[PDB]
Amino acid sequence: MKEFYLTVEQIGDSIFERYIDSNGRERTREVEYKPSLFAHCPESQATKYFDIYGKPCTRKLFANMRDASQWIKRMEDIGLEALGMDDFKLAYLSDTYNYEIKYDHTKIRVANFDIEVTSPDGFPEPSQAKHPIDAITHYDSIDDRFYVFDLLNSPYGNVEEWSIEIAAKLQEQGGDEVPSEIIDKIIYMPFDNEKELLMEYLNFWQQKTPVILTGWNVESFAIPYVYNRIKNIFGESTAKRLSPHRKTRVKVIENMYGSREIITLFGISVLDYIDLYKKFSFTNQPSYSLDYISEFELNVGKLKYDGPISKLRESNHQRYISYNIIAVYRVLQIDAKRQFINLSLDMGYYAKIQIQSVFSPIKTWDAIIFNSLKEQNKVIPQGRSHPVQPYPGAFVKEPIPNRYKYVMSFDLTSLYPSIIRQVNISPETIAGTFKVAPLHDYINAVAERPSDVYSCSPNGMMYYKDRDGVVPTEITKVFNQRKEHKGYMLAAQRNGEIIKEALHNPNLSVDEPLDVDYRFDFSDEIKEKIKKLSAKSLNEMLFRAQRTEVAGMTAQINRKALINGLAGALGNVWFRYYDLRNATAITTFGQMALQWIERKVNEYLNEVCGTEGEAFVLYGDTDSIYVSADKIIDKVGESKFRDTNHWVDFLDKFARERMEPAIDRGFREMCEYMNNKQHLMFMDREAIAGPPLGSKGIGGFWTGKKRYALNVWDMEGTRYAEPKLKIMGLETQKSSTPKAVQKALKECIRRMLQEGEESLQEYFKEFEKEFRQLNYISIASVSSANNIAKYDVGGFPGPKCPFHIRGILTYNRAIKGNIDAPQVVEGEKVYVLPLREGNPFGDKCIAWPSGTEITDLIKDDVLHWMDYTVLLEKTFIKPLEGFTSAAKLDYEKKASLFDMF
Template identity: 35%
Template sequence: MSDFYINVVQHGNQLLVREFDKGKRVNRRVTFEPTLYVHSRKNSKWKTLEGRSVEPVRFKSIRDAKDFLNMHQNTPELVHGLNSYQYVYIGDRYPDFINWDMEKLLLITLDIEVESENGFPDAQKAEEKLLCITVKNHSNKAIIVWGIGPYVNDKVRYIECENELDLIKKFIQFWHKTQPDVITGWNVQFFDIPYLCNRITRLLGEKELKKLSPWGIVKEDTVKQTQFGKAQQKYNLLGVSVLDYLDLYRKFTYVNRESYRLDYIAEVELGEKKDPNPYETFREWYTKDYKSFVDYNIQDVELVDKLEDRMKLIELCMTLAYEAKVNLIDVYSPIRVWDVLIYNFLKDKHIVIPSKRVSKKDEKYEGAYVKEPQTGLHNWVMSFDLNSLYPHLIMQYNISPETVAAEGNGDVSVDKMLKQVVDIPQDGYAVTPNGARFRTDAQGFLPNMMETMYNDRVKFKKWSLEAKQKFEDTQDKRYLNDISKYNNIQMARKIALNSAYGAIGNQYFRYYDRRIATAVTTSGQLAIRWIENKVNGYLNKLLDTTDVDYIIASDTDSIYVRFDELVSKLNPKNPVDFLDKVAKEKIEPYITKCYEELAEYVNAYEQKMEMAREVIADKGIWTAKKRYILNVHDS
């Protein structure tokens, strides 16, 4: 029987814990006794990142630990340890792999409909009456609707209410008794939940509002929602995780859509559309045809539920959270995820983390390299991609907070390193194009983590593919769970790896160091420009040309190479097969050789650049940076 946490929050002097204990769901208030660490002259099993001994200082309460930290606020370097104690609790209580079960969690999809007597309703003012509330249980697919007016539908449980006040009271009664773990919906974070909270407060007062939280604690907050460019109100129902499906879709699909209306996304992803409004106005609809209006409300929760069945973004979010041992809502923050990942990784090695300090970000620094493309039409294009560039750069140069040298390498730049005019001494330090130097006598914790996570990702991806093959061979449905589980784990590792630089380059990250942040970006520029130059040289020699630029475009970790001249010269019967063979037998081995030369030049800890052919296209059109279209034959 597997136990796992549902939600752990720090509130005042206590931790509010929701978890499964011996298979039973429990809510408990924990009086937590924190431990921090201070420098010690005695040899100790606990060390700092620099290898200095520290000894534990135990406190009777969170308040005592907070007072101790306040005493040392001017000398934070003397105190070590994580003071977000909910994550300390999770890490201590669940030290091993967490075998969580989505079926045990109560995931509710929520959607409300309100009157629109005065245009689109304002969630913060909540002046319009609630017309109906619909929820759907993701596990058993049961739908409950609270409405005002007659409605019959055998597929849902409909609760007819006398008026709006009766509707709200009955909904609160259900919610308080049921205590959901996770709420989702489409824009539920910034409309449905704040509207409900504000309307409940307006009509029944804050006492009733508090029943939406299993702890009786509801906090109002204001956040800047960048896509709309304005501050928006949100509510934190302590103990309940809100995973807005709109936010998940934006974060984890890596595509730009022309619209993010649920109707549009459902059509793109599911091939389904919501029923159109049969009347001129929304008001006419709910006043003249209440039944079809409620059907419309039900469609919203059905579509979000179907999106999850198809895309499994909530399942992916949960996988990432339980891998990192954070709360579900923390997956939106790479800083939080990586802070806790590093804490647990180092704790297992008896290394304590430094106190968190907000660093000053002096000025904006250069990011990835994007070449000005050769605009227009190009024939026979192949692209070559570097594999997980930033994580592998961290591994290659051994980039880590405890490996960076105090002294830099003087006047260094990407251009100078491309020309190999920088004198790099063989003194046990790798050098990056920003002039930073990193020890190579021992692997740093950050590249160690990257390597472990990357290798695990490869392993789980392989297991997922093997399970898929076994299912196809046997049609045994037992393998379906393995396919989903292993694929989610490998995707969670991929997301964590790809988000690492988002944390490293943020001034609010515990380990932020401008030298480290720019070491990653400038070494990335060097890697892609190095290979651009080398491949150009190779093709000029092969085709007996001089200074012809065969690289149409390059962007961060990819180059797009024109092979039209080679195809025209040799006129192969099947150009796609021919180019595939050229890539495998000639270009890729040459690229590997060139990256080995780069690794040797910069004194790399190890050569980690892996570049492989991605697509073969017979035509490609570029109009500007990052604006192109390819007619792909093989990828």
């Protein structure tokens, strides 16, 4: 096999590399890598090295990396550009792996671990590590084993061994329900004392040294805790055995309001799963506890126990250990679903970076572009200092708030990357500038043509047309990967819909799910067999289809995020290729494109309808248009349609055969107007939306910018078995909105769009009547909580104190003195409830950590004093009044003359 790196580090004048050799074995090596850097040189000096602008460079070969670094410093002191890859390990990878890397994930040791630490005096601070580590479960991907290290004797209690037999039994048998599929994969090791547990752990770790190290909050808790506890017991040298090169660094993570410490283990790639999830999931959750995320992703129930965690080991060590093992398995289950580890490896090996660098799009793109340029003997510029400056972004159309019955939406495929490629925007392709006219003048095609030579953006920038820039070249490569995966995602989605249809008629038989590739549209043969399958088999297929879709979603959306990140990286001062001219070339062209095509679409439809001055485009944001199709439907007449799917087809056909060619001609003209390199503005139909045929549903509504809802029948070519709501921006979509309120507001919207005013009034009346029975957590608002100290004045609210922060201060007073009550963590999320006038808490709200039950110390009082009236008005009635007045609808029945009867 071809060799691939596992990890790479610079330590002084050495590169330390762990790698898989040509025989599939793991090796480590120290290499005295001699880096090269570059300086500009005279034209008369023969070279093969050129900077990205075609200026000649001399290569400087250094005796060692320290010399290269010292040279960089002296080049600053002189005031001359020191060119080349200053991150020498990236240059090492580029030299050592001068090919497209094919990696074999079965050779990569992926470790998932979780530790337990009993603490009577509150949260066990990792930087102190003053309490014994009493459980470690460490799953190894190569062995496919859960290694359990269980402490039986502690200052906080002596316990009996954990029992695999009880662990396996049902909760209803008094067991822990550790999933049977992992029971045989558990290797249980009890220890008499913590010293021997830790010593054995380190020996195990040497034998099976993680390459990828993950788990839940491992970087902020488990790793620094284990490191510091071993440091405190045995000394630093022993603790540094967690690094295969025996090198570690305390790393200080700073943000706006404070800083925290992590432990960098040289020669390991830590990908904390909580951070993978935050970057890659495209969710915003009310809580990031593993219990909360597991329930959301996997539909598994919360891990249940009596009393606080601080007493669980002594009261129920059996459950304590089982829940430790289950917690490690839950992260593996999430990854089997989301496949974020697979994604990180793909992207990291593609870019040729330390895998953990996938968290930084700047670092990822710096390496991709470096490797691209190096291939052609080109030399990258030195990174420079830039002051942070604001710059303009997208255009968003102000919609007229209203109901909108029939809507067809369109938007650009990979808008910003397509702009980059079309215009040929790149550091080295800048050809110059032209005199800019007001944007409105380009939008209406009255401005002078910018250039007859170069490819232009309406911000004044001109680019070469003879050759593709490195940015368009590299962005195109990832875009193409994105498109392949999106194809698989969309096929799986359509396949899912076929299964749902077939579920309306399940067969009474015993059979199997069909062995199929859900990434490809089902053939007629498969479709036939599906119509003969049982509900059990169908549901299993649907589950598999949806997992396939999830896998496709992860691969496509995060590749989309990568290329979109390049567009934004051009507007970050830390990026090697920061340039506001290019960042704004993209965004300004985007604004033109939208408004240009709005004008074209209006012109086209006014034409087909024999009208003048009518607005058919009702809204748009960045790269999208929403087109009113009422007039198109009305031209055939609702009476001519057999059912909803009939007019959906008709609109689908109209969009495909009339709208899209019209849209395409409009953009081709714009491309010529701007003299662009290649026409790449492809604005495909997204959604077809309307009420069910013959209903009183209103179909859709807008309340304002970034606030709308649509009843959609077909999304990007997926024809749904049941209509699906596309809701954007509204309260149903905000993690801040109480869970039960999100649900009620969604059902209010479904009724509005699908059934009409009377159905909405019927539901509202019931919700208003019954909501006081809703569980307190389900009706609590949610907020991130920053600057709790800033607004704390003797435990009371200082001036301008935010409502949620006030709730926390109330909580803090109510639990004061308790070393045991859960603390609110600065920067994390809280539930918030309003309190009735004259409550014992002495303020108008209380807040506590989200994803948790409020401590029993105060729970009864909170429940008794919860202000349901304020809660209802603020979270439910106010947003609903906003939806209904926008939609010209009443959520309560108004009096009429009929009431005389």
